[PDB]
Design a protein around this ligand. Structure first.
Ligand SMILES: N[C@@H](CCC(=O)N[C@@H](CS[C@H]1c2ccccc2-c2ccccc2[C@@H]1O)C(=O)NCC(=O)O)C(=O)O
Ligand SMILES: N[C@@H](CCC(=O)N[C@@H](CS[C@H]1c2ccccc2-c2ccccc2[C@@H]1O)C(=O)NCC(=O)O)C(=O)O
Ligand SMILES: N[C@@H](CCC(=O)N[C@@H](CS[C@H]1c2ccccc2-c2ccccc2[C@@H]1O)C(=O)NCC(=O)O)C(=O)O
Ligand SMILES: N[C@@H](CCC(=O)N[C@@H](CS[C@H]1c2ccccc2-c2ccccc2[C@@H]1O)C(=O)NCC(=O)O)C(=O)O
Lengths: 217, 217
């Protein structure tokens, strides 16, 4: 089987866990523990960080027989290629490439706020700008069923994660954007995904590592 | 022609400027000014940020007739696809995807240090870890002429930029890694690139925006 390795948190690996599920991939997971305070021991991972044969050791990592892959987006495109979940025309490739990169920037901005010691101050300011972020995703989707167009691709997995994390943070955030509420529902309605969400393999939370100031531990 | 828009700094756009050059693309550049202190006025860009028809307005942006693209990596893959500068086998696609994402993480870590108010403190600590980063790039390249293998691809443009920025920061950093010194030289020896470096279109510096604590203004 493929081996997926990552911390015992949702972090930036939810889309990969979801895609492995969707595609019916045979896999095993290693979920590394993180020390509690104050030294947040990472010994468990650091012991093996250089013993796995990865080119640029990192978490997450995917091991597929001879292929050893790091960088979340790279793991996403490898599974995409194997299962034909890429854009098939130039317009679709474009949309996929922009959104891939935009889904990372949206996740990183949320992580910045949640990890800052002055969270209680940043939260309000993050929320102020939330209607603009959501609007741009909503206008992008339009009346299409999925982000690339008529076909589900791997980017729908990463945008689902951005949306989900934001609705956990601020439950009301999708109410003024119905195509986005609808997308969430439709993604959560795919059989393999609803089965997974009800299984003991599921890990929705915590999102962030234990030092976060909002949902880490 | 295509329109490339970005701040009047090197920032994360050097690879795009280089690739436009390499490929002999017909283009025009808009380079936006940034206010000097303390308010670092961005009015010049913000005036047009929403008037260009971009889906997720950002800098850099590329306009190619009907296509309007944001996110640096997305702009890189669009030019790559048009000019056949992608990996052609699965092993090559993999390498390209990992390095694309790893070149971003290396650039972001350098930017974090250069932008921190406590730079003079971070510099030493960044340097301590530099031999490990360089080693991993060097072992990755091996005896190949380019990063993907035998073919130049767009990732060579982004890794060239990482390497160049680091040798500006710490001139001695490539001396213990000759395949990396050699790659730099070979990239800088391509005709279109050496012509560009000597033209009035060239912008090597400043790297960072004016609020940086090391090379911004
Ligand atoms: N891709 C389908 C496959 C579904 C799937 O991969 N189940 C695994 C067992 S599940 C996994 C695991 C994943 C997450 C959390 C825990 C576990 C786990 C727990 C106890 C014992 C073994 C495990 C394992 O580490 C399995 O063994 N499948 C057949 C095989 O690999 O030949 C789906 O994604 O829905
Ligand atoms: N661009 C890469 C980035 C790879 C990378 O940074 N990995 C972090 C873990 S990922 C990150 C994160 C990002 C967003 C949301 C949460 C997390 C997170 C969660 C739990 C614990 C640590 C984190 C972190 O804050 C890691 O711990 N690396 C092992 C190492 O450094 O030895 C990728 O897309 O794959
Ligand atoms: N891709 C080849 C093409 C080379 C190329 O694109 N030169 C542009 C003029 S150059 C550009 C510019 C680029 C950077 C900085 C300044 C300028 C600039 C300055 C004054 C007046 C016009 C300009 C313009 O904004 C040109 O007009 N070429 C023919 C055309 O577009 O049909 C190369 O990359 O080496
Ligand atoms: N993931 C995206 C990221 C797009 C993005 O963040 N763009 C910044 C400029 S880029 C950044 C930077 C990153 C690394 C090195 C330097 C810079 C930089 C230089 C000058 C001035 C501002 C900067 C910044 O610190 C910008 O100003 N956006 C317009 C806006 O926000 O309205 C991409 O890869 O394309």
């Amino acid at each position: 089987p493929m081996i997926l390795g990552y911390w015992n948190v949702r972090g930036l690996t939810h889309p990969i866990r979801l895609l492995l599920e969707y595609t019916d991939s045979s896999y095993e997971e290693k979920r590394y523990a993180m020390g509690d305070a104050p030294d947040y021991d990472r010994s468990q991972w650091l012991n093996e960080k250089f013993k796995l044969g990865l080119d640029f050791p990192n978490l997450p990592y995917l091991i597929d027989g001879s292929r050893k892959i790091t960088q979340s987006n790279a793991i996403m495109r490898y599974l995409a290629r194997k299962h034909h979940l890429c854009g098939e025309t130039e317009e679709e490739r474009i949309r996929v490439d922009v959104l891939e990169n935009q889904a990372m920037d949206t996740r990183l901005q949320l992580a910045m706020v949640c990890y800052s010691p002055d969270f209680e101050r940043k939260k309000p300011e993050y929320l102020e700008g939330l209607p603009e972020k959501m609007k741009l995703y909503s206008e992008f989707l339009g009346k299409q069923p999925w982000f690339a167009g008529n076909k589900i691709t791997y980017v729908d997995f990463l945008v689902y994660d951005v949306l989900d994390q934001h609705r956990i943070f601020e439950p009301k955030c999708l109410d003024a954007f119905p195509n986005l509420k609808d997308f969430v529902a439709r993604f959560e309605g795919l059989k393999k995904i609803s089965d997974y969400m009800k299984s003991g393999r599921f890990l929705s939370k915590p999102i962030f590592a234990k030092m976060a100031f909002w949902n880490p531990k």
